[PDB]
A paper describes a structure:
Importantly, binding to LecA is highly dependent on the complexation of a single calcium–ion present in the carbohydrate binding site.
Additional X‐ray crystallography studies were conducted with selected derivatives of Tolcapone. Gratifyingly, both compounds bound to LecA in a similar fashion to Tolcapone in binding pose II, which was determined to be the dominant pose in solution by STD‐NMR. Consequently, the key interactions of calcium complexation and H bonding to Asp100 and Asn107 for the catechol moiety are the same. However, the distance of the carbonyl to the Nτ of His50 is increased (3.8 Å) compared to the distance observed for Tolcapone (3.3 Å). Here, the angle of the ester residue varied between the observed monomers with the alkyl chain aligning with the protein surface.
Author numbering:
A (entry chain B), B (entry chain A), C (entry chain D), D (entry chain C): 1 to 121
The structure:
Amino acid sequence: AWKGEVLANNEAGQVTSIIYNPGDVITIVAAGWASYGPTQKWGPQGDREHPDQGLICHDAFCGALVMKIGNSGTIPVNTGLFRWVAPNNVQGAITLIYNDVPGTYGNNSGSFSVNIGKDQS
Amino acid sequence: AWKGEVLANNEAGQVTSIIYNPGDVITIVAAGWASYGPTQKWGPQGDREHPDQGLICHDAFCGALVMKIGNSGTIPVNTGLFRWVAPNNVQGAITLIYNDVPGTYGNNSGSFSVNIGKDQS
Amino acid sequence: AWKGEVLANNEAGQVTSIIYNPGDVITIVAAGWASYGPTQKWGPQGDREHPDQGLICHDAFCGALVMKIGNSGTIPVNTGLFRWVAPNNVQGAITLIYNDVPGTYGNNSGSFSVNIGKDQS
Amino acid sequence: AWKGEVLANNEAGQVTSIIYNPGDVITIVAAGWASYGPTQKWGPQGDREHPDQGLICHDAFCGALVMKIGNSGTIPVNTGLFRWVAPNNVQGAITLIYNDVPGTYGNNSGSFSVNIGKDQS
Ligand SMILES: CCCCCOC(=O)c1cccc(C(=O)c2cc(O)c(O)c([N+](=O)[O-])c2)c1
Ligand SMILES: CCCCCOC(=O)c1cccc(C(=O)c2cc(O)c(O)c([N+](=O)[O-])c2)c1
Ligand SMILES: CCCCCOC(=O)c1cccc(C(=O)c2cc(O)c(O)c([N+](=O)[O-])c2)c1
Ligand SMILES: [Ca+2]
Ligand SMILES: [Ca+2]
Ligand SMILES: [Ca+2]
Ligand SMILES: [Ca+2]
């Protein structure tokens, strides 16, 4: 299992110790509060009122938690995933990232606390 | 495992199939959007700007997911719990509930989708 | 989880740390060599050539590993059980016992090494 | 998870669907009765009285269950392995094999039933 913090202001994303292999079943739980700029804060699902303009992951809101697995594209995590199996041919190390627009992470604040474990399979 | 929806207007809470027994290790993942009355919606950690004026759970925000286990008081769930063990003396059936003030559930809207499983021990 | 030795001369059996509750899924692995009398020894499936003339568990061989769950009657374990769920209405502490005839444990020798864990459910 | 039978007379061993990847934790439970020649039978620990006269695995008895992970050397399985982790550099498909002397498989009989799964990590 891996536990750690994902800073909203970390454009590169936080690499985890988890290597996703074919067939693997994993669980992720994400909590806390962060911002893409405003004094207001949002949870891991982000700000459902913010537009999608140039976000790294078009499938989640601004300020959501997303991930990449190896060199996949971005995949939504949000609050987390229960006993989840990736699509065919997705494999590698799990990096977690705050969903925002490239070049705009400087004004971000806060962090999410995230756990990831491999489940029985 | 149990998977189901928790309606925000359900004052009694959603009973699950899960019986928490001494020594159990559990994982919960909650997702979605709901409202304790306003047109806006919030995720499982609720509205961090809303005052607590009589919530069923004073350790979580208005609109957050909470639970009771058997005869326990409310216990925060929020986005979820990763490989969690219950407080001393806590055991029994898990009921999931939207955190709002007694008697004001009629104007709530939405639902959270929740998964619960028992982990290896 | 629980790891321990079960002596073949132990008539009362070895009580583990595991309490079996409804819905639980367990795995058992048993290894080693023991005897009900002879200078020879057998593994956890026992002696497939020996008669049953009053074994505590009529569904396994003399010299096999068996168990009780709470006040159940005996259940075969043998080499082990993989992600097993018990019959209805069985609950309580797991007691591991060597399968022999009541009153004859005194000439027994050796032990099995046993791992028990609860699995994800 | 994977379940299947491993014949005593199969010199090549039985390929499973389990790919052991670095950091995997696995459980294996084996049961049953087989023979490397004699009319009598033995369990997955094999025959503790028979000499090693060129077994494919010199760390288990003749008639024991062993395995390869990819093109590893032989690894003892016996009755099973509880929440086990492989040696460094060991990875690939798990192949289960009856431990006998090469070219003597033709007088073998019986089989073992084996479950393998990956465990929480
Ligand atoms: C795809 C990379 C090129 C984008 C350049 O344009 C932007 O930076 C751009 C364009 C439209 C909306 C936004 C936006 O939603 C946005 C998001 C932010 O977190 C933020 O801090 C700022 N900001 O600092 O101005 C803008 C940003
Ligand atoms: C029948 C209910 C008893 C009323 C007690 O509630 C209050 O007086 C009171 C005062 C300030 C804020 C709140 C509150 O946070 C609150 C929370 C709500 O979800 C809600 O639907 C209502 N509401 O519609 O009246 C008020 C409630
Ligand atoms: C030995 C004290 C009295 C128990 C009574 O045992 C029997 O009546 C009975 C009758 C038939 C077979 C067996 C038997 O399978 C049996 C099994 C043993 O492990 C053992 O050590 C002995 N023993 O030492 O005599 C007998 C026992
Ligand atoms: Ca920003
Ligand atoms: Ca309300
Ligand atoms: Ca005896
Ligand atoms: Ca042979």
